[PDB]
Structure 1
């Protein structure tokens, strides 16, 4: 089955003050609805209550290539198509599982030749409300593996397809 499409390209946003017209270059929006992932040090006690909030929606770096290459504060919350990218971010103690519409497909938007194209990123302008955060798995730092008996579902997750 194909995915439902919301009319609002930032329907998912935790911070709706994000300014879609300030995004550069012109974004190529993700139209698939597979699970995405985010390595984050922040704990589920916080993420499940707040969602993923972006560092700066008003004065942050709205330029995608600038944000990818130099992680200045931005209106974006980064995620990945790649379940296993947490192995590269071993320091972050969690691999979050996300089921959210939309997002800017970084490689479709700025190409797949830049330094970080292997990150297969999707950038959420305005972040990601908790209802789109499936859950989380803690990461064992020494083996770069998920502690699967310690995964936790987000009580606020609301399936939508």
Structure 2
């Protein structure tokens, strides 16, 4: 039962995320099909990364909007590169796929990021955990 830290960029505010966690959009548990196209069929994984710098282009929509970077601690994630190997399509994302999503209780905090990639000087703690 080993826990690890991972990160996610999201446009959704911490008021929602701290309450409801990160939910999936589909029932498919096939990791190969998740990697090919996680909307066809819609997959039962939430994407996170072990590399926090990889969240910023996504959270800002390529330097166009503000957003948030979330930090979490989980023990149920699936290391995609580990499962797929050389044919992992986007190996440099260092993706940890979370089956069935991430409970609100496992989200530790949030730190906002503006469109120019500048972030808060602090992290807001998840009160559902603290």
- TM (norm. structure 2) is 0.84
**Runs of 4+ displaced beyond 4 Å:** none
Structure richer in strand, relative to its length:
2
- TM (norm. structure 1) is 0.69
Residue 100 of structure 1 and its aligned partner are, at CA, apart by: 1.3
Query: Does 1:99 find its partner at 2:73?
Result: yes
Contact 2:49 2:55 in 1 (8 A): no
Structure richer in helix, relative to its length:
2
Q: Which runs of 5+ in 2 are unaligned?
A: none
- For residues 77-116 of structure 1, the C-alpha deviation after alignment (integer angstroms, 9 at most, x for no partner) is 1111101112231327111000111211111011144331
1:87 aligned residue: 56
Residue 67 of structure 1 and its aligned partner are, at CA, apart by: 1.6
Contact 2:35 2:89 in 1 (8 A): no
1:63 is aligned, of 30, 38, 41, to: 30
2:9 is aligned, of 39, 50, 56, to: 39
Contact 1:36 1:81 in 2 (8 A): yes
Residue 141 of structure 1 and its aligned partner are, at CA, apart by: 1.3
Q: Which runs of 5+ in 1 are unaligned?
A: 6-30
